[PDB]
Nucleic acid binder design. Structure first.
Ligand SMILES: [K+]
Ligand SMILES: [K+]
Ligand SMILES: [K+]
Ligand SMILES: [K+]
Ligand SMILES: [K+]
Ligand SMILES: [K+]
Ligand SMILES: [K+]
Ligand SMILES: [K+]
Ligand SMILES: [K+]
Ligand SMILES: [K+]
Ligand SMILES: [K+]
Ligand SMILES: [K+]
Ligand SMILES: [K+]
Ligand SMILES: [K+]
Ligand SMILES: [K+]
Ligand SMILES: [Mg+2]
Ligand SMILES: [Mg+2]
Ligand SMILES: [Mg+2]
Ligand SMILES: [Mg+2]
Ligand SMILES: [Mg+2]
Ligand SMILES: [Mg+2]
Ligand SMILES: [Mg+2]
Ligand SMILES: [Mg+2]
Ligand SMILES: [Mg+2]
Ligand SMILES: [Mg+2]
Ligand SMILES: [Mg+2]
Ligand SMILES: [Mg+2]
Ligand SMILES: [Zn+2]
Lengths: 51, 135, 131, 89, 154
RNA sequence: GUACCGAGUGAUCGGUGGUGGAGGUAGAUGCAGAGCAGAUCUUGGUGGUAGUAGCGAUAAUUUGUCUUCAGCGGCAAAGACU
RNA sequence: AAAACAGUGAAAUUGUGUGUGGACCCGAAUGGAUCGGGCCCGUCUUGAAACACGGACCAAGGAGUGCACAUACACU
RNA sequence: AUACCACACACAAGGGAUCGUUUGGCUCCUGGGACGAGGAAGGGCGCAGCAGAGAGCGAUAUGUGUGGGAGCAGCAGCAAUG
């Protein structure tokens, strides 16, 4: 909800910046072997436990 | 190839027509695909084949073994020996009356030519003569 | 035979040491032999190949060819030589890389620090040769 | 009833993020953390060997301890501007 | 490249194939079965009648509990069906071969459907929720398709 | 690895033709984590049942018109409902 | 928890083509109708085809071992 | 049995066994046995030209000195004034 503590807000801000795919240029690099970022999440499928 | 051992030439056909074509398939290998055809003796308490009821198949045993003279003889009337070198044929020089040579599968073309040339001059029968070297 | 027990003879250890090399140890991998004449012009028997030097290819598809070194790939250990290439379905041409040890040096590129590099190695020999 | 309909009432939250260990296990009413016993001075007894090795020295970064080993190897040389103080001492 | 499932000459034949199509396997092979050995213009005419409910596809292998119908009498059976989604796809596929025939320099007539086959493609997974807290499968079954038509010697 | 053909009472062994693209045996001895149909066996993959059972408690929907390229999607006009 | 090579690519299972049969095995044959014999395996049990239990199908894994102490045999 | 069901063989599907390979594991031996009020071990948050995770590093987030010496893996730019 609208009321939040400072500690809860920083957890949300960090959880929101980490939630991104692999940038499209990295895929062209000779040494790079990842397909998809397995740390990506959806609000419909997991809980953060920020509480 | 149509060749015969000269000592048995007038007898070889009687011998060949006399060989059994019986097979000893494993019990119920016809019923489930997980059981292979290879013989194993049945050991069940109730089993109809072990107990030898009429109508069940026959089991292997010593009675079916061939006479000692006929045994191991190829249909051309010779016994076989495996070879892989020129220096192997040298062993057969005393035995060529009854034995013939079969070159091992892994020996390649360039080497096979050298084996066959030696076989011709020593007078030894090679049964894989055509082999891969037909081309 | 090896009598020093601090040096390893394990296949697993020797292989890891090769592929995970860095720095100066990586440079040692790019060495090639000099031709008979250059081994009189200079003391050295072998040097690390650099752009602009002139090389004869002594093994492979491009055997007998001569040309100038265009590029040095350190990560995938290969050298690109002018005029050694393959053509795609498109007609476009791609330089094919050759492993250092299949080359031989015919003329040295003497740009930059090369003359000092050579001097440093010649002195290191004599220091112990004359003793 | 004790199954599905009772699940609807479960909207309160007894644990929050602990400031000593990070583990979302500080019980607000009890005033105690269930992972690390904060605010007690010592850390909690861990239940078994498997679980405690997950939080030992060397599971994180070891920043200070690594530098100390390198300095000991070098003979504790110190800042080169101040060699005279070192040598006197 | 693609290895077609039988050997017919490149001259005097026309071909097409597709992979992982999203028409339903069992419906598609009942369609293909009935138009085998038929002349191409006849095939296209027949499939137009199926879309209008004027004629039907008869069923023989994937046919349990199916409805009976007076249109099935044309093929000596009682059981038939109208699988619109598969028919629209096959019709498009056949029409394109007449373009290829014309452009290649054969006639638009005397072409006969000599070979046609359907294969199963890998499943696409799905789920439905059941009672007592269970989850059950709800998958999709796509297909692969080949056709070859040849000119009659006559 | 796959078709054929030969040898052995049998456990098994040998050859020939396609596929494959870098390693492999014969004799005598040594050490064993050394042979499967079953255990409501363990893990992974696939059938028959079957184009079948079902997918539709609640207020309700029709016509034109544009997109969509084939969404009862959007907009107008009616008919209903909380 | 799973997940090695962008190699090789078995079996279960599916489609198309060509042949042979109506569950299948053993013995003996025809140009051709077939003749004779056979109940479902494993397991406890006096006694199993059982209206006793386990088994839908295929691959891979899967159960008398190591040490100490006396012992009888064979070998040095 | 025109079309169903079964089996055999050839071709196409479906799955990942087998054989070939291994910058990993395990066991024995030898060395080592070096933390913190000068703020440790462990947690969080920031820092890249395009940068999510991981690695490295602290608002000095690639600074200084010594010994060397050729490129920085993609794209744009840098480099014997390193
Ligand atoms: K809140
Ligand atoms: K949520
Ligand atoms: K036989
Ligand atoms: K019994
Ligand atoms: K006998
Ligand atoms: K927890
Ligand atoms: K403690
Ligand atoms: K079927
Ligand atoms: K098994
Ligand atoms: K058994
Ligand atoms: K593979
Ligand atoms: K493959
Ligand atoms: K029992
Ligand atoms: K009974
Ligand atoms: K029981
Ligand atoms: Mg309450
Ligand atoms: Mg409370
Ligand atoms: Mg019906
Ligand atoms: Mg339901
Ligand atoms: Mg529920
Ligand atoms: Mg090779
Ligand atoms: Mg075992
Ligand atoms: Mg119904
Ligand atoms: Mg009302
Ligand atoms: Mg009883
Ligand atoms: Mg059961
Ligand atoms: Mg096994
Ligand atoms: Zn805590």
């Amino acid at each position: 909800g609208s009321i939040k503590t400072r500690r809860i807000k920083v957890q949300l801000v960090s959880a929101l910046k980490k939630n991104r795919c692999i940038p499209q240029w990295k895929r062209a690099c000779p040494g790079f072997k990842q397909q998809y970022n397995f740390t990506k999440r959806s609000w419909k499928r997991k809980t953060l436990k920020a509480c | 190839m149509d060749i015969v051992n000269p000592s048995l030439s007038k007898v070889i056909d009687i011998i060949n027509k006399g060989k059994s074509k019986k097979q000893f398939k494993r019990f119920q290998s016809w019923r489930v695909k997980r059981v292979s055809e290879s013989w194993r003796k049945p050991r069940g308490i109730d089993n109809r084949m072990r107990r030898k009821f009429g109508g069940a198949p026959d089991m292997p045993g010593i009675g079916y073994k061939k006479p000692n003279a006929i045994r191991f003889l190829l249909p051309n009337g010779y016994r076989k020996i495996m070879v892989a070198c020129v220096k192997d044929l040298e062993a057969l020089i005393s035995l060529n009356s009854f034995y013939c040579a079969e070159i091992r599968h892994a020996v390649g073309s360039k080497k096979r030519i050298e084996i066959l040339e030696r076989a011709e001059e020593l007078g030894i029968l090679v049964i894989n003569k055509e082999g891969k070297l037909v081309k | 035979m090896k009598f020093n027990k601090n040096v390893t003879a394990s296949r697993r250890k020797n292989r890891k040491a090769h592929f995970t090399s860095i720095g100066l140890e990586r440079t040692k991998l790019m060495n090639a032999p000099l031709s008979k004449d250059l081994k009189e012009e200079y003391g050295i028997k072998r040097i690390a190949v650099r752009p602009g030097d002139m090389v004869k290819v002594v093994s492979g598809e491009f055997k007998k060819k001569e040309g100038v070194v265009m590029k040095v790939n350190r990560h995938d250990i290969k050298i690109e030589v002018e005029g050694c290439f393959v053509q795609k379905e498109d007609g476009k041409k791609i330089n094919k890389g050759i492993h250092p040890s299949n080359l031989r040096i015919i003329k040295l590129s003497m740009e930059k620090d090369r003359a000092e590099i050579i001097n440093k190695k010649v002195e290191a020999m004599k220091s112990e040769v004359k003793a | 009833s004790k199954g599905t309909p009772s699940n609807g009432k479960k909207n309160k939250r007894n644990h929050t993020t602990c400031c000593r260990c990070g583990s979302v296990s500080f019980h607000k009413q009890k005033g105690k953390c269930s992972s690390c016993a904060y605010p007690e001075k010592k850390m909690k007894k861990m239940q078994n060997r498997k679980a405690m090795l997950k939080k030992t020295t060397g599971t994180g970064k070891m920043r200070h301890m690594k530098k100390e080993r390198i300095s000991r190897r070098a003979g504790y040389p110190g800042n080169p501007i101040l060699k005279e103080i070192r040598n006197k001492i | 490249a693609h290895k077609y499932s039988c050997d017919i000459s490149e001259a005097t034949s026309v071909r097409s194939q597709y992979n992982n199509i999203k028409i339903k396997f069992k419906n598609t092979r009942e369609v293909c079965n009935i138009i085998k050995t038929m002349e191409l213009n006849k095939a296209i005419a027949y499939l137009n009648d199926v879309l209008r409910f004027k004629k039907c596809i008869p069923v023989f292998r994937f046919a349990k509990k199916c409805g009976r119908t007076p249109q099935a009498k044309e093929f000596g059976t009682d059981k038939g069906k109208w699988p619109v989604k598969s028919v629209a796809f096959v019709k498009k596929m056949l029409e394109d071969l007449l373009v290829e025939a014309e452009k290649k320099g054969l006639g638009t007539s005397e072409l006969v459907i000599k070979h046609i086959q359907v294969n199963q493609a890998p499943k696409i997974y799905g789920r439905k929720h059941g009672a007592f807290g269970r989850i059950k499968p709800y998958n999709k079954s796509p297909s692969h398709i080949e056709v070859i038509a040849v000119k009659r010697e006559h």
